[model samples]
Target: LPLDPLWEFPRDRLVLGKPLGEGQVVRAEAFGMDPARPDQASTVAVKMLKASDKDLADLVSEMEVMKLIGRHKNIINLLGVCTQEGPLYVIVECAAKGNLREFLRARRPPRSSEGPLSFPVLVSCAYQVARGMQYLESRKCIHRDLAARNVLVTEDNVMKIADFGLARGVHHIDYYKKTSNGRLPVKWMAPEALFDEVYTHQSDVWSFGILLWEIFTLGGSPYPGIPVEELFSLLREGHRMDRPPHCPPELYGLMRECWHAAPSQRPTFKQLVEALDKVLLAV
Candidate 1:
């Protein structure tokens, strides 16, 4: 079944089908819309799915769970869900500029001589993401996969967390079930997650640290030059990406706090939000 184009500016919309031959499409409806004309265009994203019995029910069920989490200005909003032809789809706010990963990839060399991030812009993004994470924490939701690729930025440069495919309920046991091998981006994951340890909200906090570095580095590759196996060993030993690789003293300190070997020592999302808010405000 074809999707009914909901918001206006359908002409500028483009369908991004999954590259893995999964028969899924992410309809980016904000492409080419006038950035200044927010009233004339509403950004919406739709994930169109193809019939599959492996985990279709789980996917739909998770989408339903996400609906209960309150909307955070820094997080992409889930509008609705639909299923047809045996494929379940989720509707969410479109990040018009695409994900941060794609944006950084498009920028040649990725690093900027200008600086890590301009004070106002960096603060804006950090505050927003922290706010979103706080909201997720309140609902006992943990974004099992958090990274630059999963974070979306708007044409106006507003950062919003997206891609809940790997999200899980904080207190749920089956959340850590292994569905597929090699589905994760190794460099962005925490040491425990890499070692098959039961993932907790704290592991997500580690990812948030990596994301902070990503923002400062203009999306630099994490653990540059280290092989996946070696990287895991290093992280397990309390090693992490060093400073001047795009992390400043203040930001690096926060990153270290999140990457601490002991999960319990990591700051809660709410604490992280408050700390980041101060840093962002001062920046």
Candidate 2:
């Protein structure tokens, strides 16, 4: 089958610019014609990968997952890709404020007159992430890594779920079969995912809980003083992180629920969206 025109951009028209983030994952701020307005320049993020044959297969699969999940305001939308020739380039909408963790850590004024981030704004961000996760769940996609670093914040204070290399679509199965070895974000991992390589929407929920912790703590590391080697054992014995300083008791309760030992016991993203909506309204 021929490539979908919707998924391919004019390679000659693309202008690859400065690096947005490093590594084989995300790189370079790219400029291209706004699909709607060729007269105006549209900025985007381009992920350039030097792919071997196997990596090419995986890259295509990653793009397919993005296509399957489709567009949502709270999810990073794939702009287009140029995989037909040369190095693989996957272009996507760039978040002006960068990833959630760095955004939270900096807590800088978006504009000169703006102050620090507000409680309502943080809650709203979490709600938006939940909305995005719910959409992914509906699409039968499991975001194996759903931590704060994988989420992006836009200039308008919008949260867009980003990073999809580890995401998988499980159309006929309840979980994705993952290999035991790889570079894993162990702290954000659910117990089932950490102990075994089983991944599901529930595992994403577990990671979301940690993401919430990161938000409340303003991008503080998970497990605080505990080292990585001891983390698994602590979690195995049913230990969980304490509420962040200044975190609301009600919000902390929800975090605890997401960290439930039983994968089935964790609330689904739909449930999380509803719960966060109520919290947002209350705030």
Candidate 3:
């Protein structure tokens, strides 16, 4: 599929800087002009991928999914792509505060509520993530990976869902299974996804429950004591993780609904957004 002409950014206009982090593709903190706001400079996260056949195809596919969804306040916005150059670039808004998981883990419960780790801030982030996921569900998109690490926080502390490499637009299909090979997110995945390799919006809900546990625990690991190998059997017997030490019973109840064994029994993103909003209002 051809990319929108306006989404094609000029190579010379991008000024790459220090690396933020890297995996299969290198990501760097960079500056670029938003096509919507050309006169002003904007900070962006640039994913620089080597021009290999498979990688390039994947990058383009990722871009297509982002384009289909357009923009949402709680979802990362794609600025433009610089594919005309040797090392292909996918430019997106930079979440200055970084990924949510590490940011939460590196801090303690705030004594005076100054940063994003505070109680209200964490609840607000959870609400925003649900709002973002609701938008994705409306777009017929499934974010196969919905962990806290996939959520980014801006300098203003707004949460934005990121990392669409495993995302898909499932317009004609109800569920997606592993037609391709890779590591699965064992702990965060729904039982249906873990056992049958089935993925749907409900599976994403299951991950959101794990993400809520991550938030309430301030980035604590999920299913803490159980070995990963034994998790499947334990889960098959209907065992769910215990509530975090400080998590309120009401909030813990919300997480339990997300982990309902029958995928259809899990709450929809819209329901989760409303539920979290209630939690935030009470805080």
Candidate 4:
């Protein structure tokens, strides 16, 4: 019945919030009472998981990652944990606006908006995400699934990197090998990732490139209707997505760099942030 500085929540007190709004995996709205201060209490969102899901490695993995990366303005704040046998959860900040993909889509007509959002507005939103990625790069956090859907945004347009559900700590290059061809978002993947299942920060950069594609295109699906079987072969042959309509030459060039065949040739997130900033200034 007391609030833990560590943020662990009691299973019974956790009020389930919303759903698939995947991998939201039981979005929860929960609260705690501070008995000493009768009028004071704390509220948090609990991201729940089941203990039997051994494939998930456990919350400690994500918790340790949060500890190492520490506190940063751009990334999500890890509130605490409710690690146990049957039921499990991790408390985190609830961004009022949800993911960036939905945010961008909402701004598009037929959703919610005053009018058409400007190109400069799109670039600025993306630049914030690049800034977050730059911070993660320094800490060597490999966000294996970097995309518009994985990023959280505030009403003030502050982008907070979240859903580390698939993130892992790394030293130097993080090369993840494949195990029996699981379903993947091939469109966001780099040539190396699609072909060999290799993942690195550079690979994440490739995915971020696709995220730019999403932002610029106003939530349009990547690669349109290309066959998945032909996607990698085409990339291997040096093919890349064309510039989104209305995309500035500078930003398109940056996206192209991220899709470079040689991962070493791709720009680091730090460089990306600088490059995006320049594009912002020029535009």
Candidate 5:
């Protein structure tokens, strides 16, 4: 019998990719062809563009420029994009080991006396993330959305920042103009970002520190149980999440430096990388 077109032999049995919320397992090969390479297998993560205002056509166009041509290791690679049925489909490389959030969930908490990750492992994760951020800084690209959920880890424990849906080019002056309609994750945002001030590379540094803390804590929720309004007030008044959630003194100090009220006071990615390396050496 001829293979069924909709659920055919090759396209029907593509590798089961990671879940993208709402019980959707991003299938690896929906189409019969591998866009990345003919002989090699390609994994695709389908991202529905309903959340974003961009239509299917616009999303494909944007993906072509952002993921295809841009050399950003932090950004998820785009193999191909297509629009069919009612939803826009984005084919991306599958980080088989899943994202940082998932990894943290599976690991023992840092505060656990028996199974905490060693200082070296933590520092290694920080260094890899910092290198990814440095590349973004050099290219004048701002990853407006930087969080643990977006950073993917490979089987060998290499951390790679991903998800560039909110990224913008620094050279594009007009991109900075606020339109007041888009949504952003406010909890992870820097103070200036919360105040509608223009975001710079420094703001991203602040987010990076938060991501580091998340990594060290093994997915423990930040500001756990705090009301959104209270959290905002505390942050505005120069207060941040309290320590003791497995946040070591040295790492805490670095986090405080990143959360400084003034963006200019934040440490450069180069400095952050050096500090993290030193912490590893001391371990």
Candidate 6:
């Protein structure tokens, strides 16, 4: 895709740059220091869709959802949105460390004897994710995809929730609706989401469990080598991922609680954060 001069929109304060480590949503950078505050740089992640691929409303979904969910240190911040008729840009803080899964994978370092990331670091990552979800839960929002892949990390190892493309707000929490269409990353989904098509905070909690599992295993794939068709029946038989290597029993137990047969039995994100905090402190 060539940088077309006619399509440009005022440089957007976001001077587009090359791929930031191959983000699948695809990204560019916001170059230069702040126009007003020259001391503050404006380097950021610019996620965009071409005019042929997306319209105004589709672009708005990414921008609007982040704004509505508001900000926290744990969740990704919406810096600004590009003004265009369609195929617009949604700007977010640049995550130099990349997403959590990638960060974990990098820790293993192939043949190196460094081992994986320390238990303390893994626990801190898990705790940070829970803290972010805790905030989302408080705001009555459901991050339809809350897996490790959706989480980004900064150079400081600070985890900020990102990618709200599938997120939706629910005013009436009690009302149950089945999402019969649309594809999703199945392994991270809860039983209700996969079978009954029900999505809620409880379902998101289930994904967080998988996220922590990924962290503990240095980013292993969930439900490894299981056939898609078999996974459902497998889940029906009350199957869950076994404890990841080096995972403490207490932390693993807390993770399992998030995968209970009934959604109501699952601990809330707030509860998960406190549990993770305790686990982190001891580590």
Mind giving the per-residue lDDT tens digits that candidate 5 earns over 23-127? Answer: 133646444454455456555666545445445445555554455345555556665444433344555656667878678778763545656466678778878
| Per-residue lDDT value at 13 in model 2 | 60
* Model 5 CA lDDT for position 119: 63
The reply for model 2, stretches above 4 Å from the true place, is 23-33, 108-115, 165-184
lDDT of 1 by residue, 191-281 (tens): 6776765677888888988887777677676777776567656767778778745356887888889888788988878888888778766
- Candidate 3 residue-wise lDDT, 25-52, digit = tens: 3344343474565556667778766356
lDDT of 2 at 40: 61
Name model 1 segments beyond 4 Å from true.
Answer: 1-23, 28-41, 84-87, 105-117, 165-184
For residues 33-73, write the lDDT of model 2, one tens digit per residue. 46666546767777765446766666667777777778899
Off by over 4 Å in 5: 1-19, 22-25, 30-37, 48-53, 72-74, 82-89, 109-116, 167-184
> Which ranges in model 3 have alpha carbons more than 4 Å from their true place?
1-3, 23-32, 35-39, 110-116, 165-184
Candidate lDDT scores, in order, read 0.66, 0.78, 0.78, 0.71, 0.66, 0.73
Clashes of 6: 0
lDDT of 2: 0.78
Residue 263 local lDDT, model 2: 83
Error of 2 at 53 (Å): 2.4
Query: RMSD for each model, in Å, please?
Result: 6.4, 5.1, 4.9, 5.4, 7.6, 6.7
Model 5 lDDT on a 0 to 1 scale: 0.66
TM-score against truth, every candidate: 0.75, 0.86, 0.86, 0.80, 0.74, 0.82
- Model 6 spans > 4 angstroms off: 1-12, 20-36, 51-55, 84-87, 109-113, 165-184
Angstrom error of the Cα, residue 197, model 2: value is 2.0
TM-score ranking, high to low: 2, 3, 6, 4, 1, 5
Indicate the TM-score of model 3. 0.86
